[PDB]
Symmetry: C2
Subunit: 123 residues, 2 copies
Amino acid sequence: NLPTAQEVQGLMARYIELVDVGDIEAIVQMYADDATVEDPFGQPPIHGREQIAAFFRQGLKVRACLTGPVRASHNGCGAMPFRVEMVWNGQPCALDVIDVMRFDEHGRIQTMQAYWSEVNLSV
Amino acid sequence: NLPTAQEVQGLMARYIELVDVGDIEAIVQMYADDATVEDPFGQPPIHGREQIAAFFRQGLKVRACLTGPVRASHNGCGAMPFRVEMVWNGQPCALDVIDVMRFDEHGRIQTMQAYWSEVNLSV
């Protein structure tokens, strides 16, 4: 069902867990089959599980952690602050990001928008 | 002009400063004259400076602080995590919130959405 505010917090926390361990197949399945992703927000979106899996394979030695609680509304929406730690070409770097996600009537991510730019990069 | 990612971080940080001291007139002026606000997201929006000022007067002994960096994009958009501390009927409480704002070509907030619900309340 349309996740309740409580379910949304649980789903988004799980989501970061998956990104942290790097289980691409499990992340991909959290999305609706025709979901769209805008990462970073401002860039043309990617649509569908095929393109999203390609996107995550390309991007995911990386760890991610929630850096604050998940903010959830009552209409299947949620927003969360987190950090991504990587090593960009030998050089390690961190990126602070905020994801906004809208879930569907099946508990799947219909749309995701990621807010960040170079000002949130610490390389 | 359409704020750059760097300008957006500065504008949103200022914004929380204003909410913290409680300068309603200065907050109101940060909004476009016909801006709309959705707080909490999921509720019908309020439109225009008159309604926004009424909204902030009604709501603002309160302190607010950024609890993480402002995430900014290159298209006049920004998202930020913060906490609001109040005393709800003698009883003190805190609310964790994430605001998403879109600025206009004049550096003013055209639209604001606040993500939170009772799950982010610690009373």
